[PDB]
Ligand SMILES: Cc1cc2nc3c(=O)[nH]c(=O)nc-3n(C[C@H](O)[C@H](O)[C@H](O)COP(=O)(O)OP(=O)(O)OC[C@H]3O[C@@H](n4cnc5c(N)ncnc54)[C@H](O)[C@@H]3O)c2cc1C
């Protein structure tokens with residue numbers, strides 16, 4: 213009755229546990245057969261971002277719910293299987309399952325001209341239903357639509373192999389004995405190559421830009437756990453750069469010495485891809501660096517260096533677009549694409565709407581989703597209020613005029629935040 217929480221991922225669950233702790237009527241509507249978000253799919257063979265080799269890249273003490281510690285015996289980087297099971301367990305322990313409608317897909321969402329919202333949802337039967345809720349929390353994720361290169365390399369309609377995205381990648385095993393080109397230098401690409409390196413007769417990694425490649429642990433301590441060190445803080449933004457710069461040459465040297473394109477801008481001023489394996493897998497010829505693809509010569513792929521290779525398949529780890537198909541109207545976004553959400557959560561013009569999770573921290577988000585849930589719960593019952601809409605558009609336009617100034621015009625930069633200062637305001 214009171215709140216429709218869209219989705220039962222890490223974010224809905226956190227949200228459904230903040231509303232219950234305050235006594236608010238609410239339901240969570242998930243489209244999948246269980247809760248867990250993306251973490252549940254690798255494991256039921258379902259098409260999602262993850263893959264049979266997906267483990268955390270952040271620490272457990274910092275990625276689990278602060279009030280629901282992850283099992284003792286779990287490692288620093290548990291696997292998709294262990295996380296999905298911790299999440300199911302959290303919903304069990306926080307009483308949220310009585311509230312979750314599974315296999316119920318939200319087809320649509322909309323404001324009526326009095327403030328409650330009609331929410332249409334699709335039952336497994338495909339049979340549709342419309343209901344009405346006073347408030348709606350969107351917790352749908354921003355990794356739902358794959359981002360294929362728009363000009364797809366010519367000749368791809370006449371390739372004799374399988375062109376695919378990391379959403380459809382599942383097991384390194386399905387590619388046994390075959391020849392594949394992973395496209396990307398992100399955490400999905402470095403991971404799929406490393407898998408394909410132990411299953412496919414050959415694995416090539418097509419890169420086009422070059423990203424600082426960091427190992428998961430420096431000095432024994434994970435990159436998230438150092439960003440929380442008091443010693444790492446209390447260090448200026450150049451004391452750190454050089455620290456790391458000095459730090460990564462001693463740990464992996466230079467990347468031009470691995471056949472990888474050097475990045476144009478230094479660490480922190482260019483994305484980092486975390487990986488403890490992709491440099492070794494190269495130094496062992498399990499994966500071979502390539503430039504970008506230029507065409508598909510039936511049975512083979514051509515690169516911008518002139519090189520050719522027989523290639524049964526090509527898995528494009530090119531990333532994801534954020535869509536909200538159930539918001540028949542502007543997604544939080546307006547104009548250049550800038551997402552317009554106050555404190556990264558509140559639509560300025562739409563009362564009754566909240567967005568939990570749209571943020572990309574440098575690190576694990578769990579603590580960021582938890583804050584948003586608590587504040588959203590206080591906004592929903594009236595224990596918290598927002599500024600007027602004109603003043604909310606000042607915080608947004610400040611965050612944006614600033615985002616184009618430390619990150620510069622680029623993509624998805626407008627959901628990007630600093631963990632510490634942002635979670636201080638909660
Ligand atoms: C491949 C990958 C690996 C990652 N690894 C890490 C990591 O190691 N550490 C880390 O800190 N972060 C990681 N992240 C970041 C990631 O965003 C979070 O781990 C986490 O998934 C956020 O959960 P969420 O609930 O916001 O979104 P999701 O996990 O995407 O779940 C959102 C849920 O909304 C549901 N939903 C969406 N639309 C509808 C609809 N119309 N009707 C009903 N239900 C709907 C979906 O079923 C989904 O289960 C990773 C992200 C990806 C893509």
Ligand SMILES: NC(=O)c1ccc[n+]([C@@H]2O[C@H](COP(=O)([O-])OP(=O)(O)OC[C@H]3O[C@@H](n4cnc5c(N)ncnc54)[C@H](OP(=O)(O)O)[C@@H]3O)[C@@H](O)[C@H]2O)c1
Pocket residue numbers: 266267268269270360361362378395396397398399400401403420421422423529530531532
């Ligand atoms: N736990 C883990 O280890 C793990 C695993 C997977 C994913 N993740 C997370 O999930 C999210 C998904 O990111 P992702 O790894 O899928 O990738 P991403 O960060 O979205 O970047 C995609 C990669 O593809 C490249 N690319 C983009 N467009 C391209 C094009 N047209 N042609 C060729 N290459 C292109 C990008 O290089 P350019 O951008 O320079 O073009 C980049 O290297 C991230 O937030 C990531 O941290 C984490």
Ligand SMILES: CC(C)=CCc1ccc2c(C/C=N\O)c[nH]c2c1
Pocket residue numbers: 426435436438439456479480483484486572573574575
């Ligand atoms: C100690 C160091 C080098 C910290 C740097 C650092 C930079 C970027 C990322 C990302 C990418 C963010 N969103 O995709 C995830 N973890 C990161 C860590």
